[PDB]
Design an enzyme around this catalytic site. Structure first.
Site, PDB file in Angstrom:
ATOM      1  N   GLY B  95      65.032  31.075 -18.376  1.00 24.23           N
ATOM      2  CA  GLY B  95      65.146  32.407 -17.753  1.00 24.23           C
ATOM      3  C   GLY B  95      66.484  33.059 -18.077  1.00 24.23           C
ATOM      4  O   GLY B  95      66.600  34.251 -17.809  1.00 24.23           O
ATOM      5  N   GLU B 115      86.637   5.003 -28.072  1.00 20.88           N
ATOM      6  CA  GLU B 115      85.732   5.970 -27.471  1.00 20.88           C
ATOM      7  C   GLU B 115      86.503   7.073 -26.757  1.00 20.88           C
ATOM      8  O   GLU B 115      87.695   6.959 -26.485  1.00 20.88           O
ATOM      9  CB  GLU B 115      84.763   5.252 -26.523  1.00 20.88           C
TER      10      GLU B 115
HETATM   11  N1  LIG Z   1      67.965  36.771 -17.847  1.00 20.62           N
HETATM   12  C1  LIG Z   1      67.758  37.572 -16.766  1.00 20.62           C
HETATM   13  N2  LIG Z   1      68.550  38.681 -16.583  1.00 20.62           N
HETATM   14  C2  LIG Z   1      68.379  39.524 -15.578  1.00 20.62           C
HETATM   15  N3  LIG Z   1      67.400  39.397 -14.646  1.00 20.62           N
HETATM   16  C3  LIG Z   1      66.427  38.445 -14.863  1.00 20.62           C
HETATM   17  C4  LIG Z   1      66.541  37.450 -15.925  1.00 20.62           C
HETATM   18  N4  LIG Z   1      65.410  36.596 -15.822  1.00 20.62           N
HETATM   19  C5  LIG Z   1      64.758  37.038 -14.689  1.00 20.62           C
HETATM   20  N5  LIG Z   1      65.398  38.052 -14.107  1.00 20.62           N
HETATM   21  C6  LIG Z   1      65.107  38.774 -12.820  1.00 20.62           C
HETATM   22  O1  LIG Z   1      65.438  37.790 -11.805  1.00 20.62           O
HETATM   23  C7  LIG Z   1      64.427  37.808 -10.819  1.00 20.62           C
HETATM   24  C8  LIG Z   1      64.273  36.525 -10.023  1.00 20.62           C
HETATM   25  O2  LIG Z   1      63.730  35.528 -10.796  1.00 20.62           O
HETATM   26  P1  LIG Z   1      62.553  34.380 -10.318  1.00 20.62           P
HETATM   27  O3  LIG Z   1      61.368  35.066 -10.813  1.00 20.62           O
HETATM   28  O4  LIG Z   1      62.846  34.028  -8.913  1.00 20.62           O
HETATM   29  O5  LIG Z   1      63.053  33.201 -11.258  1.00 20.62           O
HETATM   30  P2  LIG Z   1      62.758  32.694 -12.783  1.00 20.62           P
HETATM   31  O6  LIG Z   1      61.355  32.109 -12.888  1.00 20.62           O
HETATM   32  O7  LIG Z   1      63.259  33.685 -13.750  1.00 20.62           O
HETATM   33  O8  LIG Z   1      63.822  31.498 -12.821  1.00 20.62           O
HETATM   34  C9  LIG Z   1      63.502  30.199 -12.182  1.00 20.62           C
HETATM   35  C10 LIG Z   1      64.115  29.119 -12.986  1.00 20.62           C
HETATM   36  O9  LIG Z   1      63.201  28.870 -14.110  1.00 20.62           O
HETATM   37  C11 LIG Z   1      63.882  29.021 -15.371  1.00 20.62           C
HETATM   38  O10 LIG Z   1      64.324  27.707 -15.816  1.00 20.62           O
HETATM   39  C12 LIG Z   1      65.025  29.902 -15.016  1.00 20.62           C
HETATM   40  O11 LIG Z   1      66.037  29.816 -16.010  1.00 20.62           O
HETATM   41  C13 LIG Z   1      65.451  29.471 -13.629  1.00 20.62           C
HETATM   42  O12 LIG Z   1      66.216  28.234 -13.704  1.00 20.62           O
HETATM   43  C14 LIG Z   1      63.165  38.160 -11.558  1.00 20.62           C
HETATM   44  O13 LIG Z   1      62.445  39.160 -10.829  1.00 20.62           O
HETATM   45  C15 LIG Z   1      63.616  38.966 -12.767  1.00 20.62           C
HETATM   46  O14 LIG Z   1      63.301  40.301 -12.369  1.00 20.62           O
END
Ligand SMILES: Nc1ncnc2c1ncn2[C@@H]1O[C@H](COP(=O)(O)OP(=O)(O)OC[C@H]2O[C@H](O)[C@H](O)[C@@H]2O)[C@@H](O)[C@H]1O
Ligand SMILES: Nc1ncnc2c1ncn2[C@@H]1O[C@H](COP(=O)(O)OP(=O)(O)OC[C@H]2O[C@H](O)[C@H](O)[C@@H]2O)[C@@H](O)[C@H]1O
Ligand SMILES: [Mn+2]
Ligand SMILES: [Mn+2]
Lengths: 156, 156
Positions: B95, B115
């Site tokens: 994400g 090491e």
């Molecule tokens: N890169 C980003 N930039 C800005 N906003 C974003 C982004 N990605 C999502 N949003 C906004 O952020 C809001 C909330 O996102 P939720 O949906 O609760 O989470 P998830 O599934 O993304 O992330 C969950 C995990 O899975 C993955 O491993 C991720 O890296 C996390 O570790 C979303 O509405 C987007 O509008």
């Protein structure tokens, strides 16, 4: 002293001496099995330019604790509720970010909603997810791989 | 268009429309068992302010492929070499970052070096690492948790 270079929506970028540090909200992920299929999800992830196999996951929002966030993202992403049990947590990449993921098991799933549409629900036997990955057909997120390994370790 | 806000040592911070994206070098991690103990490492991680339980891991450097990077960081962090087999890969947190980790199994370990000192070598039965984590005594990195789950799934 942390010095901030960027304060954003879903991250802050800081310097702490020589170290580059990304502050990030904590996350949750839910492992769920039904009739030998695990509940995966896929969505386009612009950071990687593809849709990896994940399990339902989300960020913990203000006011929520991990269990509550896990319930919410299971319902929002898949329309399901279940009985949640905390399993374990992990830091996704502690050499540069503080993001911590809390992983839950869900049992006794029931449909509470007929959901967020840009998320594809992918019920798939974990044995098949692992095979597709070994053959190059799908990429995993950490949460997807943790789900598959946990199943093989403890849910057969 | 990716627009860059920060170009650093171990990451770049970019905007891509609404998305905040952290570009990061790919990583490797090595799962190794000897006499029922798994090879963990711990080091202070300023991003999280603590030393989580990890497995030997590192970034892939210019010119290297994942296997070569895995051999190198096993030797640099623990003084060991072994026979390496590729297992699987995962995106640490797709994400927001493109960091991808390639995980290997090491067998037939031998000491090649007596090491890097700021890394603590922690041989520990994975059953005990999981118990200590369940009791709140140690935190996991993703690589540490993947090692423990993989052992329980496939190496008993
Ligand atoms: N890169 C980003 N930039 C800005 N906003 C974003 C982004 N990605 C999502 N949003 C906004 O952020 C809001 C909330 O996102 P939720 O949906 O609760 O989470 P998830 O599934 O993304 O992330 C969950 C995990 O899975 C993955 O491993 C991720 O890296 C996390 O570790 C979303 O509405 C987007 O509008
Ligand atoms: N935040 C940082 N900022 C700047 N430089 C750093 C940072 N952390 C380390 N370095 C420098 O970067 C150099 C190369 O680091 P290697 O030692 O190959 O990797 P690893 O074990 O850190 O990371 C391996 C994975 O394990 C974790 O999950 C991580 O998040 C990664 O996913 C080091 O010499 C440091 O001098
Ligand atoms: Mn999500
Ligand atoms: Mn390292």
């Amino acid at each position: 002293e942390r010095t901030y270079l960027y304060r954003g929506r879903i991250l802050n970028l800081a310097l702490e001496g020589r170290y580059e540090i990304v502050e990030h909200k904590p996350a949750v992920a839910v492992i769920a099995l039904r009739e030998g299929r695990m509940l995966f999800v896929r969505q386009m992830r612009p950071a990687v330019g593809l849709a990896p196999l994940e399990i339902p996951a989300g960020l913990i929002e203000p006011g929520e604790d991990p269990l509550e966030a896990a319930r919410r993202e299971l319902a929002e992403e898949t329309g399901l509720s279940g009985d949640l049990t905390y399993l374990f947590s992990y830091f996704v990449s502690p050499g540069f970010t503080d993001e911590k993921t809390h992983v839950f098991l869900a049992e006794n799933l029931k449909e509470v909603e007929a959901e967020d549409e840009a998320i594809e629900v992918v019920w798939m036997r974990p044995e098949e997810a692992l095979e597709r990955h070994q053959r190059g057909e799908v990429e995993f997120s950490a949460t997807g791989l943790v789900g598959v390994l946990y199943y093989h370790a403890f849910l057969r």
